[PDB]
Amino acid sequence: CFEPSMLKKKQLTVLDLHPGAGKTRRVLPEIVREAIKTRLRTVILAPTRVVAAEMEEALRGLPVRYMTTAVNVTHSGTEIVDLMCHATFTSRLLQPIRVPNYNLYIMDEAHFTDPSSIAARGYISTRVEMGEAAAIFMTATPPGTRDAFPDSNSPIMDTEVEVPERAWSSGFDWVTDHSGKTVWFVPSVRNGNEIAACLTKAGKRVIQLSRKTFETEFQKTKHQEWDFVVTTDISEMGANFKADRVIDSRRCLKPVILDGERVILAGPMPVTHASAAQRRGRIGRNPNKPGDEYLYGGGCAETDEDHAHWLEARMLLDNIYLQDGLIASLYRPEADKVAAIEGEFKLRTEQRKTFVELMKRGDLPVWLAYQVASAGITYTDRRWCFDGTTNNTIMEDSVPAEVWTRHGEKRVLKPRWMDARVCSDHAALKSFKEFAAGKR
RNA sequence: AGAUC
C-alpha cells in the first residue's frame, strides 16, 4: 500500500489495487494530500472524463487545478497539483509548449491500452529512470501481469460456460432464469443490440451502454429497475452497478494493422487479462452480499501485441522531445510489445508538425496521421482522401460515400491509406467527410 | 470497440 516514501525522485511504484479496494476514494486522496503538504508539483492522470469527475468528488476541498471541462470548480491559482486525462497529457507533450517539470506523476488505471496512455507511461517511466521524477501507477492489473481473477471485496463464483453471442430461441435457460441483476459485456454495439433485443423479447428490462449512449443511459442504471445491462467495454472503467452477476463474452473489437498496409476493426478478438479483470470486477463488491457470479465464455488473449495501439504509442513517443533529442522508451514491462527499433518513427521538423496537427486538429487516428505526414503531404491538402485504390472506397449504406469537396466537386471517398476507424460508425464517417471536404 | 482537446 501507499507510504510517503514513494514520493521520492527515481521511485516508480505500482500499486496493485484490486477492484473495489478504494483506489479513488481512499488511496488517491491519501497520495494527493501528502503531495500537497510537501508542495510537490504533481499531475494526476485520469483515463477518462467520467473518471476525472469521480476523482473531483473524492478530492473535493483539496486544491487541484482541473485541466478538463469534465470538472468545473473555482481555482485559487496556488494549487500545486494538476489533474488531466491521459490523452490530454500526451497531446500536450507533442505540442511545442511548456509542460511543467512535474516531480510526481500519478496515473490512474495504468493498464489502459489507449495509445496515448501507453505513450504516457513510457514518457513517465523514462523520466523516473532518468531521476527527474517519481511516479505512482495504480491498477488492478499492472502491465506485465496476467491475472484475470484478482482479489475482490466478496468471493466470486467463477464459471466458464458457453456464452451466447447471438440471439437465441433455446439452449441458454440459465441466462433468463436468473432472478437477479446482470451486467453483460459484449464486443460491439451491434452485437449488444442483438442480445438486448433478444432479452427484451423474453420479457427482460434491458439498458444498453456504449460511448455514444453512456451519459444518458448510465444514469438510468442508477434510477430505474433493470434486469440486464448490456454494455461495451466502456464500462470497464468509471462505471459501477448494483448487480450479482456478470456475463462476459471475453471478446472485444480493437484496431489491428493488417500487413503494415491498412487498419481494420476485426472480430472475433479475445479480451486481455486486464480487461477481463475489470469486467469481472463489476461484481463481488459488497462483503454483505456473498454469492456473486462471473460467467465467462472463453480465454484471454495470450498477447495483445497485434493491437495497433502499441505501434501507435511508439509513433507518438518517437515524436515527443525529451532532452538533447533523446527518445523515451515504452514502460519496460510493455516494451517488447513493439519490435520496431527506437526512433523508427521520429519525423523531421516539418513532417512532425503535420503529424501533430493531423491528430490535434484533424482528429485522425495516430497510424493514419503518420502515413499522411510521412508522405510529405501538408495538413490542408486533402487530395489523398480521394485517390486510393478502389478497395479503399468508403461505403455508406452499402453504396460509395460521397463528399462535396473544397473545390465544389462531388467525389467518392477513397483514401490513399485505409483506416477502418474513420468510418466504423456514423459519427466517425461524418467527421471524416468534413475532413475530406476541407472543413477543418 | 475505446479515447482526448
Numbering used by the authors: 178 to 617
What does the paper say about this structure?
The NS3 protein plays an essential role in viral polypeptide processing and genomic replication, with a protease domain at its N-terminus and a helicase domain at the C-terminus. Upon RNA binding, the helicase domain exhibits intrinsic nucleoside triphosphatase activity, which then provides the chemical energy to unwind viral RNA replication intermediates to facilitate replication of the viral genome together with RNA-dependent RNA polymerase (NS5). Given its essential role in genome replication, ZIKV helicase could be an attractive target for drug development against ZIKV. To elucidate the molecular mechanisms of ZIKV helicase in recognizing ATP/Mn2+ and RNA, we determined the crystal structures of ZIKV helicase180–617 complexed with ATP/Mn2+ and ZIKV helicase172–617 complexed with a 7-mer RNA (5′-AGAUCAA-3′) at 2.2 Å and 1.7 Å, respectively.
The 3′ end of ssRNA binds to Domain I, while the 5′ end mainly interacts with Domain II. Compared with its apo-form, the ZIKV helicase undergoes obvious conformational changes, largely due to a rotation of Domain II and Domain III, once it binds to ssRNA. This rotor domain rotation caused two α-helices (residues 365–379, and residues 390–400) in Domain II and two α-helices (residues 525–537, and residues 602–615) in Domain III to move away from the RNA binding groove in an opposite direction, enlarging the groove to accommodate the ssRNA. Additionally, similar to the DENV helicase, the ZIKV helicase binds to ssRNA by a positively charged tunnel identified along the domain boundary of Domain III, which directly interacts with Domain I and Domain II as well. In particular, the side chain of K431 in the ZIKV helicase points to the inner core, forming a salt bridge with the side chain of D410 and a weak hydrogen bond with N3 atom of the adenine base. The specificity of the ZIKV helicase for RNA relies on multiple hydrogen bonds between the 2′-OH moieties from the ssRNA and the carbonyl oxygen of D410, side chain oxygen of T265, and six water molecules (W1–6).
